[PDB]
Design an enzyme around this catalytic site. Structure first.
Site, PDB file in Angstrom:
ATOM      1  CD  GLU A  58      14.538  10.564  25.670  1.00 37.81           C
ATOM      2  OE1 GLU A  58      14.734   9.346  25.974  1.00 37.81           O
ATOM      3  OE2 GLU A  58      15.181  11.517  26.181  1.00 37.81           O
TER       4      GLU A  58
ATOM      5  N   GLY B  25      11.483  17.931  15.511  1.00 38.29           N
ATOM      6  CA  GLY B  25      12.546  17.641  16.473  1.00 38.29           C
ATOM      7  C   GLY B  25      13.819  18.336  16.047  1.00 38.29           C
ATOM      8  CB  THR B  26      15.932  20.825  16.871  1.00 39.85           C
ATOM      9  OG1 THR B  26      16.301  21.110  18.231  1.00 39.85           O
ATOM     10  CG2 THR B  26      14.572  21.416  16.562  1.00 39.85           C
ATOM     11  N   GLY B  27      18.335  18.875  16.972  1.00 37.94           N
ATOM     12  CA  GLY B  27      19.541  18.484  17.686  1.00 37.94           C
ATOM     13  C   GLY B  27      20.655  19.501  17.540  1.00 37.94           C
ATOM     14  CB  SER B  28      24.111  19.783  18.805  1.00 37.20           C
ATOM     15  OG  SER B  28      24.545  18.448  18.666  1.00 37.20           O
TER      16      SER B  28
ATOM     17  N   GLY C 194      21.332  18.802  13.473  1.00 43.95           N
ATOM     18  CA  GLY C 194      20.301  18.457  12.511  1.00 43.95           C
ATOM     19  C   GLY C 194      18.912  18.813  13.012  1.00 43.95           C
TER      20      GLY C 194
ATOM     21  N   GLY D  42       3.808   9.475  17.625  1.00 38.99           N
ATOM     22  CA  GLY D  42       4.660  10.122  18.612  1.00 38.99           C
ATOM     23  C   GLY D  42       5.716   9.207  19.267  1.00 38.99           C
TER      24      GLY D  42
ATOM     25  N   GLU E 180       9.787   7.086   6.223  1.00 40.77           N
ATOM     26  CA  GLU E 180       8.322   7.059   6.416  1.00 40.77           C
ATOM     27  C   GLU E 180       7.924   7.828   7.683  1.00 40.77           C
TER      28      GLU E 180
ATOM     29  CG  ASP F 280      16.038   9.345  16.361  1.00 42.13           C
ATOM     30  OD1 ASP F 280      15.163   9.462  17.272  1.00 42.13           O
ATOM     31  OD2 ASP F 280      15.974  10.099  15.355  1.00 42.13           O
TER      32      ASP F 280
ATOM     33  CB  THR G   9      21.591   9.169  26.058  1.00 45.05           C
ATOM     34  OG1 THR G   9      21.265   9.456  24.678  1.00 45.05           O
ATOM     35  CG2 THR G   9      20.855  10.143  26.958  1.00 45.05           C
TER      36      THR G   9
END
Ligand SMILES: N[C@H]1[C@H](O)[C@@H](N2CCOCC2)[C@@H]2OC[C@H]1O2
Length: 339
Positions: free
Chosen positions: A159, A39-42, A44, A115, A110, A173, A190
């Site tokens: 998500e 997974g990716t973000g702005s 990290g 998913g 962990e 998260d 969000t």
């Protein structure tokens, strides 16, 4: 309910001990082998890694210190690490190691191979009401725990929820979570899930997490969230009107619960009244829920994700694989002294 009072009293005692004495620097990067980007973000990325000595698998979150300062997330990343090293609950992902180097911050959690709930919802279409109700009960219990510690979560959405090896939820998260006595003011979250008082720049409290639970239960049962549009400004107009239309297949008990969670007036919203979370636990839509059996994980889940073993990545999606480079010089050392 005495057994619930004593449970939460002890939960807060154990949280405060770790809160006042946090751990730091408990591993380093070359203790792990890199496997795949999850997974990716702005600011990290999250990677599957394997510990070289034990062979255990972990989800390693890598935050770029320079991009954290630019996107103004320094206090948020210090909130996240301090909270995750202090909590303990069946449906929260546990922090195992943390450390920093010249370029990055690292949180090692962990690894949960089933998913994101988002992927399964979109593959099936919508969840039946018993299926949505099983997941919702785990979020109610997790918020009862967090709010009793004076924590607000501030990013509930599909998500951010993983499905584990027993078919139960794990919340991850914690990037916007914060310890709050009274009110707080930061704009974050969000768009589709924001409560009206956040959009209007007001001081707000734990009631915004209960609003977001209303959005999540609607999305699980319908297949789409209640407020949607192509631009955030149009989403915000629908939210503060709060006019919501329900599919005809929703039960009457479900519509009643959602009208009380998606209440635009925060002083009337379920979860924020004199009886707290028990207005939700005692609502007719939850009449069949065994709250103790869920906490003890004795209920058979709606489905178990398909995966071959603890290192299987088939339930996550594909992202471009980039380097983890560490500068020869130290960056932003002062700003992250406490990490
Ligand atoms: N007290 C006022 C509140 O806005 C509402 N209450 C919120 C607290 O709990 C129950 C009801 C209701 O509407 C008008 C009046 O009664």
């Amino acid at each position: 309910q005495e057994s619930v009072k004593e449970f939460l009293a002890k939960a807060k005692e154990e949280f405060l001990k770790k809160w006042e004495s946090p751990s730091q620097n408990t591993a380093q990067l070359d203790h792990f082998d890199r496997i795949k980007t999850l997974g990716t973000g702005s600011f990290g990325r999250v990677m599957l890694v394997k510990h070289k000595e034990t062979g255990n698998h972990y989800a390693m979150k890598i935050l770029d210190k320079q991009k954290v300062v630019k996107l103004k997330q320094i206090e948020h990343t210090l909130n996240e690490k301090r909270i995750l090293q202090a909590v303990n609950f069946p449906f929260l992902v546990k922090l195992e190691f943390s450390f920093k180097d010249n370029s990055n911050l690292y949180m090692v959690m962990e690894y949960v191979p089933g998913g994101e709930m988002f992927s399964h919802l979109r593959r099936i279409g919508r969840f039946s009401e018993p299926h949505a109700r099983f997941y919702a009960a785990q979020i109610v219990l997790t918020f009862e725990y967090l709010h009793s510690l004076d924590l607000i979560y501030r990013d509930l959405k599909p998500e951010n929820l993983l499905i584990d090896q027993q078919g139960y939820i794990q919340v991850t998260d914690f990037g916007f979570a914060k310890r709050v006595k009274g009110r707080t003011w930061t704009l974050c979250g969000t768009p589709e899930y924001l409560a009206p008082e956040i959009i209007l720049s007001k001081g707000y409290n734990k009631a915004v997490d209960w609003w977001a639970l209303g959005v999540l239960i609607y999305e699980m049962a319908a297949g789409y969230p209640p407020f949607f549009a192509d631009q955030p400004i149009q989403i915000y107009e629908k939210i503060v009107s709060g006019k919501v239309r329900f599919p005809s297949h929703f039960s009457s008990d479900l519509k009643d619960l959602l009208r009380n969670l998606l209440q635009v007036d925060l002083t009337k919203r379920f979860g924020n009244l004199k009886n707290g979370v028990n207005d939700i636990k005692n609502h007719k839509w939850f009449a069949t829920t065994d709250w103790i059996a869920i906490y003890q994980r004795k209920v058979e889940a709606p489905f178990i994700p398909k995966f071959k073993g603890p290192g299987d990545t088939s339930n996550f999606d594909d992202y471009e694989e980039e380097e983890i480079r560490v500068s020869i010089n130290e960056k932003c050392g002062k700003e992250f002294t406490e990490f």
